[PDB]
Amino acid sequence: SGEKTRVLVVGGTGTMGRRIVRACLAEGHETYVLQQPETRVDIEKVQLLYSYKRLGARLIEASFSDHQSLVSAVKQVDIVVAAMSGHSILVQLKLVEAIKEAGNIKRFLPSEFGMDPSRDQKLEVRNAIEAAGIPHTYVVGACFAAYFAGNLSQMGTLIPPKKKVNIYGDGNVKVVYVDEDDIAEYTAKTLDDPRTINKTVYVRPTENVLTQMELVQIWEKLTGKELEKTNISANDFLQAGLGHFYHIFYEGCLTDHEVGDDEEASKLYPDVKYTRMDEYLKIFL
Amino acid sequence: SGEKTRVLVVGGTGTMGRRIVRACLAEGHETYVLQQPETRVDIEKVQLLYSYKRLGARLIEASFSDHQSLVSAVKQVDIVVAAMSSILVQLKLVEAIKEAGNIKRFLPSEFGMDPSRMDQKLEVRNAIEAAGIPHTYVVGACFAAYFAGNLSQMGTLIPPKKKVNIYGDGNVKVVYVDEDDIAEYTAKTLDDPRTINKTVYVRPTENVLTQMELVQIWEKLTGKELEKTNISANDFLQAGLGHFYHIFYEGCLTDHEVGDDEEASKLYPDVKYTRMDEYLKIFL
Ligand SMILES: NC(=O)C1=CN([C@@H]2O[C@H](COP(=O)(O)OP(=O)(O)OC[C@H]3O[C@@H](n4cnc5c(N)ncnc54)[C@H](OP(=O)(O)O)[C@@H]3O)[C@@H](O)[C@H]2O)C=CC1
Ligand SMILES: NC(=O)C1=CN([C@@H]2O[C@H](COP(=O)(O)OP(=O)(O)OC[C@H]3O[C@@H](n4cnc5c(N)ncnc54)[C@H](OP(=O)(O)O)[C@@H]3O)[C@@H](O)[C@H]2O)C=CC1
Ligand SMILES: COc1cc(C[C@H](CO)[C@@H](CO)Cc2ccc(O)c(OC)c2)ccc1O
Ligand SMILES: COc1cc(C[C@H](CO)[C@@H](CO)Cc2ccc(O)c(OC)c2)ccc1O
């Protein structure tokens, strides 16, 4: 009843935000969603937002250009999660100023969910959070399945190729492919977890640590068709986004440091039966 | 098992199309959704399409610029429903339907004002009828999301807080319909022998309301009256504003009777269509 953590989700109509909204409701949190003036005959945003009320969330109107309305919104919750487009990341600095003036917020989870930026606008938001003394949790370390697994890490499409695939290097660099729904559930589980206050939580579910070639081979075993592979060397991979890609697939930046059980999502929350990539890929068959 | 009508939905990731996909699934039709290539780069579209598979729909890949893929798609079904916007894109669909020869009925992208009073939809209708393709035209409603939830105010989709523009005297009857009900009516009519080669008017009786009636439904829900500013026809100097003028000044959705044999809520009385007082509650 009154036991619930009250969470405000900022960016709740986004790809990752909507998942976090639902994950927070499904965890049992009293879930609030920031409603931005953005009606501009955006029928998708509107109906998504109001679909949340049917599930029991509440909407809080505020505007990022109206400092006191952000202050007013965060004063109604205990915890703030932001999941902005990732100019949107730096918009969170206004959010930090409001949390700081509000004084009531117990934890802020900024818009991370990807490459650890501590190896740039995400770092600027971390520094602001830590400067203001706002307790935080940084959720990092995953490749979104929809942008990297469903297309077999090909670019410019979101579904499996039918005949041919580009392999980056030899495709033996380890990558972390995670269904975005699992990222959202780990986020909902960790945001009031005392174990993860002021920590980085790595989302590295063990069985989803895979090379690209391992991901491709999962697909070939599902379809029973060998794809024609073309290996692309680091140098042929001669704008920033291709740079993100190079750090993941050529430098192994998601897997090159081990992580402890006290800081890895699937060990912290072993009850989350995360989606393996053979299961994830079946929907495309 | 296999006594189900097979239906292909074109435009399945759009506002109406997605509703029609689900309504066909809910009606028990073996449901197919056209999967177009430019879908591949849009994660909203992709998650939508593939979520249909989890509900039991199949996807058919085809492209409008590839006649043979259209032909191959329509040979897998018995009925085709299109819900676009690109209205003229349906011409390619018609030639495909024509060549395949197996389609028992085509429902083109209508779901608004009957164009045959009022253009690109008429061109499509001419092509449908010139090819001898049996048809059903679903018309006659204002989408509740675009006209009811905003109390028919413009530039917003949610109820206003204080002011509201009343058009004329707000005494002209308009037809406000939950898009879900339009879709279910479509799903129910598409294989119904009474509606072959007919126009079906979606005009549920309790939802024939003047704008002022709609506003008063909201005031009874909030307990607050709003500031009303009336706008004369002439101040009503966008071709969406023309649509609006026809609806709220000329009353073009309601200036003509429709018979029970051609009105969806009489044809399909088990559809408990959403009344506007229920529809607006979500905004309280
Ligand atoms: N492979 C991976 O690991 C992936 C990780 N990410 C990361 O996840 C996080 C969320 O990314 P993503 O889901 O793609 O973001 P989205 O593009 O889906 O946007 C989500 C929300 O951001 C808000 N937003 C966007 N632009 C603005 C703006 N100018 N002003 C105010 N609000 C804005 C909106 O809030 P509202 O809903 O209220 O309208 C929107 O709903 C990011 O940190 C991103 O880097 C993203 C890609 C894949
Ligand atoms: N007040 C009212 O009653 C309203 C009436 N309508 C009517 O409803 C019907 C459907 O409209 P609506 O659901 O709002 O449409 P949308 O704007 O939601 O678009 C629907 C789908 O049409 C496809 N599409 C759009 N452009 C193209 C194109 N150039 N080529 C190929 N496909 C395209 C796409 O299908 P895909 O998923 O396959 O990519 C798109 O997702 C129309 O006849 C319209 O006049 C619409 C608005 C309100
Ligand atoms: C994994 O870690 C991160 C991942 C991201 C998302 C990246 C970059 O934006 C995605 C696009 O969103 C790349 C991509 C993938 C497939 C595609 O077909 C594609 O076409 C252009 C682009 C951001 C930050 C991260 O830390
Ligand atoms: C009922 O008759 C029809 C109705 C439509 C929908 C029309 C567009 O054409 C809607 C937008 O899609 C107009 C609109 C609505 C609300 C708004 O806040 C708005 O911003 C100003 C503009 C289509 C075809 C029809 O036959």
TrEMBL record, chain A:
Keywords, sorted A to Z: NADP, Nucleotide-binding, Oxidoreductase
Binding-site positions, NADPH 2: 13, 15-16, 85, 111, 122
A molecular-function term among this protein's GO annotations: nucleotide binding
Tree of life domain: Eukaryota
Biological processes annotated in GO: lignan biosynthetic process
Domain NmrA-like: 4-281
Positions contributing to NADPH 1 binding: 12-13, 15-16, 36, 45, 85, 88, 111-112, 122, 144
Pfam families: NmrA
PANTHER family: PINORESINOL REDUCTASE 1-RELATED, PINORESINOL REDUCTASE-RELATED
Family, similarity comment: Belongs to the NmrA-type oxidoreductase family. Isoflavone reductase subfamily.
Protein name, as recorded: Pinoresinol-lariciresinol reductase
Annotated source species: Isatis tinctoria (Dyer's woad)
Lineage: Eukaryota, Viridiplantae, Streptophyta, Embryophyta, Tracheophyta
